[PDB]
């Protein structure tokens, strides 16, 4: 079980600091190295820096030399990444990577990767979502739900408590200028089934503990 | 001296009093192997080796026969049949510097373990991967020595400790290193069992 | 710093063809210090090839790698449905260990026109003082599509936002959702709301509208 | 590691033939009296086999 587990999602205000953890398993941490890489939503991979676990020596990128410090603790076989003076530009997903090694030799690349830690930096506050119905117009029709004005990401949407999956499109959320997110989830069904099949969207937002079951009606 | 460059002193023909050192609370560690620490003055061996170095407190437990760790495996290994003593004392006031000391190093990587009483001071770049390092550090190519960075504010487990390991070697030669061998008062005109010089 | 560039930007290929990706470095780098990673949406990168010509553990043998110096190539002999994702090349010899910009490998398909649907804002949201009109583009290819909002024949700009889903795993099509956001006052100041969709599969832009109230 | 088997490591004098000593008194290896308190130069006479 050569594993690499990272912290959970983080939501910090601008001007603060975040410390992302990255714990190793399976291989011998003491003789390996750990790199940190960031990825903005829909962007490429941006290398932040690396650290030698045994020595503690660090190398950072030019763009992260000023606000990122990578550390490690061989006793708890965990490496950390401190990011000071957060801002909206820092809202991204952060990965840690390490070669698996035995007691004397190491792998020649970064083959073990963490699941990723999403860090959101904004002035917004926790808020539950408003679910509005997108009714189908009066052979196939489309209907859905609008999960509007919630924070932070993400929300999960299901149809018929998971029974309806075919033809379902849940779009990725957009960040409005108000700081809240908006998401649309649609489904195409035959026009005949509109009067003899109740459609209910199940919107769940764990950060706000919000569970909304909204029934879509043909006006 | 540094732990990887441990210093060895040779002791031939000189009387010594291990009682003023054993009775000293200054020494944080006084542990002997193969010979009792109390009964030490009577023993006689032809030569004495004195290995000296500096480590950190958490590593003082590694200076013992049959131990494993960074120091025991890559810096200083004691044989299983070691016959001698290990003495250690806290040297924070001497070997610790604010900001970290850069004078004491320790070997961090090595492909094989050290033989008993082996001394390795090579600075070859350790190849941790399959790709050969060509004198340049990088991924899977690290420098074998690392600095302790002793600071006065460090935890006592990380503070500097001076360690001296005394070993007593007997060869096919006359035994020239002897203990104090104190004496007592003498009484006359009474039947006594006596033990003079030899 | 060493700059890594990847090509092509989008690799539209059919399942079963041979894929070929290129990676260029701004200066000569060691072949034994280059890696290729695969990343799927919502997933972590996965190492495929290292040392330019060393297959990783568990990676199928259809993935191969070649190159030397400044030019490197990643070759997929037979493209599988589980291989359509994003590919990166990274050099890890000289610091900083920069990454490439990525290559999206999508499933090639025949031109499909989008099904256009318009949704007026619900009365429940209208009670909140804000109106959101939604335009859905369903099952189309390629991904490139154009949506224009017209409110009483007045083209809108700067008050709408779009969102595109990933390529579907079954029909290899994309879906688009555009949301126009107005105040309740501005929503009640007009009557006809329409979205015009321009796409390759449409011989002419298709317009879907509704009359406020009807 | 089985430590249930012990052996006496210090004693003020050698045992006479077939003599048995099971005392756990703290052995004073130095000039400082121990007064039943373990510490520097004050050792537990028994030690476990490894
Ligand atoms: C520690 O591992 C090295 C290298 O093993 C390789 O890399 C690992 C990450 C893993 O993927 C292994 O399956 C790989 O084989 C060992 O070094 C090799 O040892 C074998 C032993 O016969 C030898 O034939 C190879 O030439 C060696 N290769 C190199 C680059 O040194 C090493 O033996 C392992 N040590 C221990 C204690 O297990
Ligand atoms: C028996 O006990 C006395 C008590 O002081 C002690 O002096 C003596 O040495 C002991 N005998 C032996 C053989 O140790």
What distance lies between CA B35 and its chain's CA centroid? 16
Q: What sign does the dihedral B87-B88-B94-B95 (CA atoms) show? A: positive
Report which of C183, C186, C141, C146 is spatially closest to residue C162, judged by C-alpha positions: C146
| Domain co-membership, A81 together with A134 | no
| Domain co-membership, A170 together with A143 | yes
Using an 8 Å Cβ cutoff, are A47 and C99 in contact? yes
Q: State how many domains chain C has.
A: 2
Between vectors from CA B44 to CA D43 and to CA D39, what angle results, nearest 5°? 10
Atom 9 in ligand 2: which residue has the minimum CA distance? D13
Distances (CA, A) of C159 to A150, A177, B172, C17, C181: 19, 10, 99, 42, 6
| Domain co-membership, C130 together with C205 | yes
Residue C178: count other Cβ atoms within 10 Å of its Cβ: 23
| Domain co-membership, C161 together with C94 | no
Among the three residues C58, C76, C107, which one is the final residue of a domain in this structure?
Answer: C107
Q: In whole angstroms, what is the distance from residue C208 CA to residue C23 CA?
A: 44
Among the three residues A121, A145, A177, which one is the final residue of a domain in this structure?
Answer: A121
Count the alpha carbons within 13 Å of B121 in the hemisphere toward its beta carbon: 8
Distance from the C116 Cα atom to the nearest Cα atom in chain A, whole angstroms: 9
| Domain co-membership, A25 together with A85 | yes
Look at residue B50 and give its three-state secondary structure: strand
Between vectors from CA C167 to CA C163 and to CA C168, what angle results, nearest 5°? 110
| Domain co-membership, A106 together with A155 | no
Among the three residues C90, C107, C124, which one is the final residue of a domain in this structure?
Answer: C107
Using an 8 Å Cβ cutoff, are B2 and B53 in contact? yes
Those residues whose C-beta lies under 8 Å from the C-beta of residue A204, and which sit 6 or more positions away, are A155, A156, A157, A158, A210, A211, A212
Q: What is the CATH number of the domain that holds C125?
A: 2.60.40.10
| Pick from C96, C138, C162: CB nearest A62 | C96
**Residue to mutate (ligand 1; options A102, A104, A107, A111; most atoms within 8 A of CB):** A102
Q: State how many domains chain A has.
A: 2
| Domain co-membership, C66 together with C149 | no
| Domain co-membership, C130 together with C66 | no
Residue C60 Cα, ligand 1 centroid: separation in angstroms? 22
Using an 8 Å Cβ cutoff, are C44 and A95 in contact? yes
List the single residue in D with minimal CA-CA distance to B66.
D50
Residue A166: count other Cβ atoms within 10 Å of its Cβ: 9
| Domain co-membership, A109 together with A142 | no
Using an 8 Å Cβ cutoff, are D3 and D50 in contact? yes
Q: In whole angstroms, what is the distance from residue B25 CA to residue D41 CA?
A: 9
Report which of C141, C200, C119, C158 is spatially closest to residue C12, judged by C-alpha positions: C141
| Domain co-membership, C102 together with C122 | no
Using an 8 Å Cβ cutoff, are B6 and B60 in contact? no
Neighbours of chain C (3+ CB pairs under 8 A): A, B
Residue C125 belongs to what H/E stretch?
A: helix C123-126
Report which of A23, A124, A157 is spatially closest to residue A81, judged by C-alpha positions: A23
| Domain co-membership, C90 together with C144 | no
Distances (CA, A) of B19 to B10, B40, B44, D32: 20, 8, 15, 13
Report which of A117, A121, A95 is spatially closest to residue A11, judged by C-alpha positions: A121
| Domain co-membership, C101 together with C122 | no
Distance from the B22 Cα atom to the nearest Cα atom in chain A, whole angstroms: 34
Query: What single string gives the DSSP state of each residue in chain A?
Result: --EEEE---EEE-TT--EEEEEEEESS-GGG-EEEEEEE-TTS-EEEEEEEETTT--EEE-GGGTTTEEEEEETTTTEEEEEE-S--GGG-EEEEEEE--B-SS-B-SS--EE---EEEEE-S---BPPEEEEEPPP--EEEEEEEEEEEBSS--EEEEGGGTB-TTEEEPPPEE-TTS-EEEEEEEEEEGGGGSS--EEEEEEEGGGTEEEEEEE---
| Domain co-membership, C12 together with C101 | yes
Q: In whole angstroms, what is the distance from residue C46 CA to residue C55 CA?
A: 12
Domain span holding position C163? 115-211
Annotate C23-50 with b (16+ C-beta within 10 A) or e (fewer).
bebeeebbbbbbbbbbbeeeebbbbbbb
Distances (CA, A) of C52 to C47, C49, C89, C159: 12, 6, 10, 48
| Domain co-membership, C38 together with C90 | yes
| Domain co-membership, A166 together with A106 | no
Annotate C65-90 with b (16+ C-beta within 10 A) or e (fewer).
bebeeeebebebeebeeebbbbbbbb
Among the three residues C107, C139, C157, which one is the final residue of a domain in this structure?
Answer: C107
Closest ligand 2 atom number to CA of residue D16 = 13
Ligand nearest to the CA of A107: 1
Looking up tokens 């990401």 gives A153
Q: In whole angstroms, what is the distance from residue A213 CA to residue A133 CA?
A: 11
What pairs with residue C65 in β-bridges?
C74
Query: What single string gives the DSSP state of each residue in C46-111?
Result: EEEEETTTEEPTT--TTEEEEEEEEEEEEEESS--GGG-SEEEEEE-SSSS--B---EEEEE----
Looking up tokens 């006065």 gives B152
Domain span holding position A153? 130-216
| Domain co-membership, C47 together with C122 | no
Does ligand 2 have an atom closer than 6 angstroms to the CB of D23? no
Q: In whole angstroms, what is the distance from residue A166 CA to residue A202 CA?
A: 16
Quick check: A107 contacting B, CB < 8 Å? yes
Using an 8 Å Cβ cutoff, are C176 and C147 in contact? yes
| Domain co-membership, A140 together with A112 | no
Atom 38 in ligand 1: which residue has the minimum CA distance? A102
Using an 8 Å Cβ cutoff, are B141 and A57 in contact? no
Atom 19 in ligand 1: which residue has the minimum CA distance? A105
Using an 8 Å Cβ cutoff, are D45 and D28 in contact? no
User: DSSP letter at C116?
Assistant: E
| Domain co-membership, C17 together with C102 | yes
Those residues whose C-beta lies under 8 Å from the C-beta of residue C83, and which sit 6 or more positions away, are C19, C38, C76, C105
| Domain co-membership, C103 together with C123 | no
Look at residue C186 and give its three-state secondary structure: helix
Partner-chain contact B129 A106, CB within 8 Å: yes
User: DSSP letter at B94?
Assistant: H
**Residue to mutate (ligand 2; options D10, D11, D13, D22; most atoms within 8 A of CB):** D13
Long-range contacts made by residues B13-21, C-beta under 8 angstroms, separation at least 24? B13/B176, B13/B177, B14/B177, B15/B178, B15/B179, B15/B180, B16/B177, B16/B179, B16/B180, B17/B41, B17/B180, B18/B179, B19/B180, B21/B87
Among the three residues A121, A141, A163, which one is the final residue of a domain in this structure?
Answer: A121
Report which of B184, B187, B163, B175 is spatially closest to residue B62, judged by C-alpha positions: B163
| Domain co-membership, A156 together with A116 | no
Distances (CA, A) of A84 to A90, B76, C7: 10, 42, 35
Quick check: C92 contacting B, CB < 8 Å? yes
Distance from the D31 Cα atom to the nearest Cα atom in chain B, whole angstroms: 8
Partner-chain contact B129 A108, CB within 8 Å: yes
Quick check: A28 contacting B, CB < 8 Å? no
Q: In whole angstroms, what is the distance from residue B139 CA to residue A34 CA?
A: 10
Quick check: B142 contacting D, CB < 8 Å? no
Burial class (CB in 10 A: 0-12, 13-18, 19+), D34: middle
| Domain co-membership, A53 together with A25 | yes
CB within 8 Å of chain D, chain B residues 70-89: none
- Tokens read off for C59: 């990676």
Report, in angstroms and rounded to the nearest whole number, the Rg of chain A calculated over CA atoms: 22
| Domain co-membership, A147 together with A39 | no
| Domain co-membership, A105 together with A151 | no
Looking up tokens 């099509």 gives C173
Among the three residues A100, A121, A142, which one is the final residue of a domain in this structure?
Answer: A121
Q: Report phi then psi at C130, rounded to 5.
A: -140, 140
Q: What is the CATH number of the domain that holds A85?
A: 2.60.40.10
């Amino acid at each position: 079980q050569v594993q690499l587990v990272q912290s959970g999602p983080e939501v910090k205000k601008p001007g603060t600091s975040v410390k992302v953890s990255c714990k190793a398993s399976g291989f011998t941490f003491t003789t390996s190295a750990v790199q940190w890489v960031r990825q903005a939503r829909g962007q490429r991979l941006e290398w932040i820096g690396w650290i030698v676990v045994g020595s503690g020596n660090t190398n950072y990128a030019q763009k992260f030399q000023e606000r990122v410090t990578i550390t490690r603790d061989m006793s708890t076989t965990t490496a950390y990444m401190e990011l000071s003076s957060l801002r909206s530009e820092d809202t991204a997903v952060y990965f840690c990577a390490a070669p698996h090694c035995n007691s004397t030799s190491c792998y020649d690349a970064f083959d073990i990767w963490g699941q990723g830690t999403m860090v959101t930096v904004s002035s917004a506050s926790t808020k539950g979502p408003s679910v509005f119905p997108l009714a189908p117009s009066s052979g196939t029709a489309a209907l859905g739900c609008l999960v509007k004005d919630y924070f932070p990401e993400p929300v999960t949407v299901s149809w018929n408590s998971g029974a309806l999956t075919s033809g379902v499109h849940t779009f990725p959320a957009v960040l409005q200028s108000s700081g809240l997110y908006s998401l649309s989830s649609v489904v195409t069904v035959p026009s005949s089934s509109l009067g003899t099949q109740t459609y209910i969207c199940n919107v769940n937002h764990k950060p706000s503990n919000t569970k909304v079951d909204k029934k879509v009606e043909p006006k | 001296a540094s732990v990887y460059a441990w210093n060895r002193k040779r002791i031939s023909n000189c009387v010594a009093d291990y009682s003023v050192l054993y009775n000293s609370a200054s020494f944080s560690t006084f542990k002997c192997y193969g010979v009792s620490p109390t009964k030490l003055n009577d023993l006689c061996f032809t030569n004495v080796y004195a290995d000296s170095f500096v480590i950190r407190g958490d590593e003082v437990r590694q200076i013992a026969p049959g131990q494993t760790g960074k120091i025991a495996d890559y810096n200083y290994k004691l044989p299983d049949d070691f016959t001698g003593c290990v003495i250690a004392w806290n040297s924070n006031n001497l070997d610790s510097k604010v900001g970290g000391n850069y004078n004491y190093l320790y070997r961090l990587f090595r492909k094989s373990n050290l033989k008993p009483f082996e001394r390795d001071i090579s600075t070859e770049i350790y190849q941790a991967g399959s790709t050969p390092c060509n004198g340049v550090e990088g991924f899977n190519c690290y420098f074998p020595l690392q600095s302790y960075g002793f600071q006065p504010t460090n935890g006592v487990g990380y503070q500097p400790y001076r360690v001296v390991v005394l070993s007593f070697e007997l060869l096919h030669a006359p035994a020239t290193v002897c203990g104090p061998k104190k004496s007592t008062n003498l009484v006359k005109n009474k039947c006594v069992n006596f033990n003079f010089n030899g | 710093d060493i700059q890594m560039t990847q090509s092509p930007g989008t690799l539209s290929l059919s399942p079963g063809e041979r894929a070929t990706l290129s990676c260029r470095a701004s200066q000569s780098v060691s072949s034994s210090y280059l890696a290729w990673y695969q990343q799927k949406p919502g997933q972590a990168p996965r190492l495929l090839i290292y040392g330019a010509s060393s297959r990783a553990t568990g990676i199928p043998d259809r993935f191969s790698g070649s190159g030397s110096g400044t030019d490197f190539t990643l070759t997929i002999s037979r493209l599988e449905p589980e291989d359509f994702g994003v590919y990166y090349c990274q050099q890890y010899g000289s610091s900083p260990w920069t990454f490439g910009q990525g290559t999206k490998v999508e499933i090639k398909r025949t031109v499909a026109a989008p099904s256009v649907f318009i949704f007026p804002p619900s009365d429940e949201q209208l009670k909140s003082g804000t109106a959101s009109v939604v335009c859905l583009l369903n099952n189309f290819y390629p991904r490139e599509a154009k949506v224009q909002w017209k409110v009483d024949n007045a083209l809108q700009s700067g008050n709408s936002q779009e969102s595109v889903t990933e390529q579907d795993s079954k029909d290899s099509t994309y879906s688009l959702s555009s949301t126009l956001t107005l105040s309740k006052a501005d929503y009640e100041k007009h009557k006809v709301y329409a979205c015009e969709v321009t796409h390759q599969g449409l011989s002419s832009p298709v317009t879907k509208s509704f009359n406020r109230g009807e």
